Amino acid sequence: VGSLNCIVAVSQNMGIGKNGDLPWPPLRNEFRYFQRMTTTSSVEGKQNLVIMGKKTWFSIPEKNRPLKGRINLVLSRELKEPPQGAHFLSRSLDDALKLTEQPELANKVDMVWIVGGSSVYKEAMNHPGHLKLFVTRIMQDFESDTFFPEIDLEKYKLLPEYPGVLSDVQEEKGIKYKFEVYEKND
Numbered sequence: 001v002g003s004l005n006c007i008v009a010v011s012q013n014m015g016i017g018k019n020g021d022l023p024w025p026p027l028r029n030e031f032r033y034f035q036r037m038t039t040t041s042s043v044e045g046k047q048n049l050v051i052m053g054k055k056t057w058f059s060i061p062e063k064n065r066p067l068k069g070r071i072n073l074v075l076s077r078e079l080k081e082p083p084q085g086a087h088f089l090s091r092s093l094d095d096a097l098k099l100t101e102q103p104e105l106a107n108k109v110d111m112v113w114i115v116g117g118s119s120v121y122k123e124a125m126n127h128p129g130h131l132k133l134f135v136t137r138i139m140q141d142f143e144s145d146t147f148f149p150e151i152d153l154e155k156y157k158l159l160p161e162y163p164g165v166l167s168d169v170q171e172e173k174g175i176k177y178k179f180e181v182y183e184k185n186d
């Protein structure tokens with residue numbers, strides 16, 4: 001099992017979702033970036049594993065469920081089995097993490113990506129250890145009902161550059177955004 005990472009797209013006012021959808025109109029390339037980063041594994045014969053809350057799983061278009069080429073794990077205390085199309089189900093972030101260390105997954109899991117939502121991000125981000133946050137900054141305010149938790153810049157260092165991550169401003173549907181990578185080790 002490799003590194004633990006969080007990936008999210010957030011508006012200026014820190015919004016990540018609204019009514020089960022993204023606060024902004026769909027951005028094709030932003031989604032492709034998300035697919036690329038979470039899918040790409042730097043270790044032959046292995047796969048990355050994505051962890052997400054129940055609401056995030058159901059917010060993803062069925063056409064894109066499960067997230068292809070990745071082991072999909074959903075967090076929920078209500079569900080009795082992984083949702084149709086999902087691979088695994090865990091009742092807490094720790095359990096999901098332990099699970100990757102089982103003989104079952106242990107040898108096939110490379111990177112672990114937390115892809116949402118709020119509660120999962122928060123717990124992971126405030127957990128001691130090595131952790132990277134891949135943050136897409138949608139440079140506009142958008143009415144939202146779900147938000148990204150605070151990034152403690154004393155711990156999380158914004159990297160000056162990162163391989164495979166464009167550093168310049170992007171724009172789709174008249175909306176500008178940029179990619180950032182943060183890293184902490186505590």
Ligand SMILES: NC(=O)C1=CN([C@@H]2O[C@H](COP(=O)(O)OP(=O)(O)OC[C@H]3O[C@@H](n4cnc5c(N)ncnc54)[C@H](OP(=O)(O)O)[C@@H]3O)[C@@H](O)[C@H]2O)C=CC1
Pocket residue numbers: 007008009010015016017018019020021022052053054055056057059075076077078079090091092093115116117118119120123146
């Ligand atoms: N812009 C972006 O990057 C992203 C946007 N989103 C968007 O955000 C919204 C969904 O986010 P959100 O509301 O935060 O919902 P979540 O995806 O985090 O799901 C919350 C639910 O998932 C389960 N859950 C979360 N954490 C845990 C845990 N640690 N252990 C066990 N179960 C857990 C619980 O379900 P249960 O009650 O059954 O126990 C809970 O009710 C949607 O609007 C979606 O479109 C989502 C991801 C990324």
Ligand SMILES: CCc1nc(N)nc(N)c1OCCCOc1ccccc1CCC(=O)O
Pocket residue numbers: 007008009020021022026027028030031034056059060061064114115116135136
């Ligand atoms: C592509 C959005 C997105 N972008 C980044 N950088 N990180 C995420 N974790 C993320 O969330 C991915 C999981 C939630 O996905 C959705 C939630 C609501 C509506 C649509 C989608 C995905 C499909 C698309 O944007 O076309």
